[PDB]
Amino acid sequence: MASGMGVDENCVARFNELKIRKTVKWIVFKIENTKIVVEKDGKGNADEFRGALPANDCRFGVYDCGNKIQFVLWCPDNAPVKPRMTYASSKDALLKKLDGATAVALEAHEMGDLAPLA
């Protein structure tokens, strides 16, 4: 839950999901206690990404932007101390696993984040 995360085979499923479609696979990967896994995957667009991302917990999603992979996550108001902390020192692993995932990512907790849903 801090540095040297656990890169699981799922960590790749995300990249292989947006790469195979290159259109929009909206893959939501959730990092567990010293491990990585995927929760969502199978096309859906912001429509599902905005109606799937739980507000009780934090979750990041990848989306082939053509050049880079801008993935943003919202901090849960139920207990951010968990994710806000883990995802903090864990972002490295993910940022490393991804392909071309620049620092354009965003991390903010607000209802307006899923309001426009793109």
mmCIF file of C-alpha atoms in Angstrom:
data_model
loop_
_atom_site.group_PDB
_atom_site.id
_atom_site.type_symbol
_atom_site.label_atom_id
_atom_site.label_comp_id
_atom_site.label_asym_id
_atom_site.label_seq_id
_atom_site.Cartn_x
_atom_site.Cartn_y
_atom_site.Cartn_z
ATOM 1 C CA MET A 1 0.000 0.000 0.000
ATOM 2 C CA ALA A 2 3.017 2.249 -0.552
ATOM 3 C CA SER A 3 5.729 1.909 -3.198
ATOM 4 C CA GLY A 4 6.688 -1.394 -4.792
ATOM 5 C CA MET A 5 3.036 -2.200 -5.443
ATOM 6 C CA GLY A 6 1.947 -5.578 -6.779
ATOM 7 C CA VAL A 7 1.677 -5.546 -10.566
ATOM 8 C CA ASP A 8 -0.834 -8.277 -11.398
ATOM 9 C CA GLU A 9 -1.730 -9.671 -14.822
ATOM 10 C CA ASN A 10 -4.804 -7.442 -14.587
ATOM 11 C CA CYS A 11 -2.672 -4.294 -14.671
ATOM 12 C CA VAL A 12 -2.089 -5.226 -18.312
ATOM 13 C CA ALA A 13 -5.699 -6.105 -19.124
ATOM 14 C CA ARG A 14 -6.402 -2.375 -18.889
ATOM 15 C CA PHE A 15 -3.819 -1.355 -21.488
ATOM 16 C CA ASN A 16 -4.710 -4.355 -23.650
ATOM 17 C CA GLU A 17 -8.351 -3.290 -23.363
ATOM 18 C CA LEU A 18 -7.950 0.270 -24.646
ATOM 19 C CA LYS A 19 -5.298 -0.840 -27.137
ATOM 20 C CA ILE A 20 -7.432 -3.524 -28.781
ATOM 21 C CA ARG A 21 -10.303 -1.079 -29.274
ATOM 22 C CA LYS A 22 -8.328 2.171 -29.357
ATOM 23 C CA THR A 23 -11.777 3.772 -29.257
ATOM 24 C CA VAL A 24 -12.957 3.556 -25.648
ATOM 25 C CA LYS A 25 -12.666 0.566 -23.315
ATOM 26 C CA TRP A 26 -13.071 2.617 -20.138
ATOM 27 C CA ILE A 27 -11.071 0.229 -17.958
ATOM 28 C CA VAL A 28 -11.293 0.821 -14.208
ATOM 29 C CA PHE A 29 -8.445 -0.812 -12.289
ATOM 30 C CA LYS A 30 -8.544 -0.951 -8.489
ATOM 31 C CA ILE A 31 -5.334 -1.434 -6.507
ATOM 32 C CA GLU A 32 -5.739 -3.704 -3.483
ATOM 33 C CA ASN A 33 -3.510 -4.226 -0.444
ATOM 34 C CA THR A 34 -0.193 -4.758 -2.228
ATOM 35 C CA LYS A 35 -1.739 -5.864 -5.523
ATOM 36 C CA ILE A 36 -3.463 -4.650 -8.688
ATOM 37 C CA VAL A 37 -6.708 -5.756 -10.337
ATOM 38 C CA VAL A 38 -9.418 -4.629 -12.755
ATOM 39 C CA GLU A 39 -13.083 -4.072 -11.901
ATOM 40 C CA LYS A 40 -14.502 -2.645 -15.129
ATOM 41 C CA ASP A 41 -13.675 -3.447 -18.754
ATOM 42 C CA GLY A 42 -15.654 -3.985 -21.943
ATOM 43 C CA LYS A 43 -16.414 -0.627 -23.543
ATOM 44 C CA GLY A 44 -18.939 1.804 -22.095
ATOM 45 C CA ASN A 45 -17.558 5.329 -22.376
ATOM 46 C CA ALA A 46 -17.897 8.013 -19.704
ATOM 47 C CA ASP A 47 -21.546 6.952 -19.541
ATOM 48 C CA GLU A 48 -20.667 3.851 -17.523
ATOM 49 C CA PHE A 49 -17.470 5.300 -16.058
ATOM 50 C CA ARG A 50 -19.552 8.070 -14.490
ATOM 51 C CA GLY A 51 -22.212 5.640 -13.307
ATOM 52 C CA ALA A 52 -19.818 2.958 -12.089
ATOM 53 C CA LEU A 53 -17.084 4.777 -10.170
ATOM 54 C CA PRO A 54 -18.126 4.355 -6.511
ATOM 55 C CA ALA A 55 -18.086 7.468 -4.328
ATOM 56 C CA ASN A 56 -17.432 5.369 -1.224
ATOM 57 C CA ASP A 57 -14.033 4.337 -2.581
ATOM 58 C CA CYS A 58 -11.418 5.504 -5.085
ATOM 59 C CA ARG A 59 -10.763 4.040 -8.534
ATOM 60 C CA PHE A 60 -8.720 4.941 -11.613
ATOM 61 C CA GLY A 61 -9.659 4.396 -15.246
ATOM 62 C CA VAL A 62 -7.688 4.333 -18.491
ATOM 63 C CA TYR A 63 -8.830 5.653 -21.868
ATOM 64 C CA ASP A 64 -6.817 5.614 -25.094
ATOM 65 C CA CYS A 65 -6.639 9.334 -25.866
ATOM 66 C CA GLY A 66 -4.764 8.533 -29.062
ATOM 67 C CA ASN A 67 -1.412 9.805 -27.811
ATOM 68 C CA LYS A 68 -1.412 9.587 -24.014
ATOM 69 C CA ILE A 69 -3.530 7.850 -21.376
ATOM 70 C CA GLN A 70 -5.166 10.445 -19.128
ATOM 71 C CA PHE A 71 -6.481 8.587 -16.080
ATOM 72 C CA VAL A 72 -8.174 10.441 -13.222
ATOM 73 C CA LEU A 73 -9.606 9.244 -9.908
ATOM 74 C CA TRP A 74 -11.867 10.740 -7.240
ATOM 75 C CA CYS A 75 -11.182 10.510 -3.505
ATOM 76 C CA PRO A 76 -13.970 8.882 -1.451
ATOM 77 C CA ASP A 77 -15.564 10.947 1.317
ATOM 78 C CA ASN A 78 -16.238 7.765 3.291
ATOM 79 C CA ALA A 79 -12.580 7.007 4.000
ATOM 80 C CA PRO A 80 -9.969 8.639 1.726
ATOM 81 C CA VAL A 81 -7.243 7.994 4.298
ATOM 82 C CA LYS A 82 -7.097 4.530 2.735
ATOM 83 C CA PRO A 83 -6.983 5.290 -1.014
ATOM 84 C CA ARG A 84 -5.731 8.875 -0.795
ATOM 85 C CA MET A 85 -2.734 7.358 0.992
ATOM 86 C CA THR A 86 -2.288 4.064 -0.858
ATOM 87 C CA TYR A 87 -3.027 5.389 -4.344
ATOM 88 C CA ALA A 88 -0.569 8.148 -3.449
ATOM 89 C CA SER A 89 2.511 5.949 -3.070
ATOM 90 C CA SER A 90 0.920 3.428 -5.433
ATOM 91 C CA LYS A 91 0.331 5.750 -8.387
ATOM 92 C CA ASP A 92 3.930 4.958 -9.333
ATOM 93 C CA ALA A 93 3.287 1.302 -10.160
ATOM 94 C CA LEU A 94 0.224 2.144 -12.254
ATOM 95 C CA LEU A 95 1.895 5.132 -13.911
ATOM 96 C CA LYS A 96 4.733 2.737 -14.736
ATOM 97 C CA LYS A 97 2.510 -0.092 -15.970
ATOM 98 C CA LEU A 98 0.478 2.147 -18.277
ATOM 99 C CA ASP A 99 1.829 3.069 -21.711
ATOM 100 C CA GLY A 100 2.506 6.760 -22.258
ATOM 101 C CA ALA A 101 0.451 7.708 -19.210
ATOM 102 C CA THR A 102 1.808 11.230 -18.745
ATOM 103 C CA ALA A 103 1.243 13.325 -15.623
ATOM 104 C CA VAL A 104 -1.867 14.841 -17.202
ATOM 105 C CA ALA A 105 -3.843 12.695 -14.763
ATOM 106 C CA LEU A 106 -6.118 14.339 -12.195
ATOM 107 C CA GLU A 107 -7.130 13.520 -8.622
ATOM 108 C CA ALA A 108 -10.083 15.426 -7.166
ATOM 109 C CA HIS A 109 -13.132 14.482 -5.097
ATOM 110 C CA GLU A 110 -16.268 16.221 -6.365
ATOM 111 C CA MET A 111 -19.716 15.391 -7.741
ATOM 112 C CA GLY A 112 -19.096 17.706 -10.680
ATOM 113 C CA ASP A 113 -16.353 15.354 -11.841
ATOM 114 C CA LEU A 114 -18.987 12.919 -13.109
ATOM 115 C CA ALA A 115 -21.589 15.606 -13.799
ATOM 116 C CA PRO A 116 -20.668 16.261 -17.456
ATOM 117 C CA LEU A 117 -19.533 12.658 -17.905
ATOM 118 C CA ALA A 118 -17.906 13.902 -21.109
#
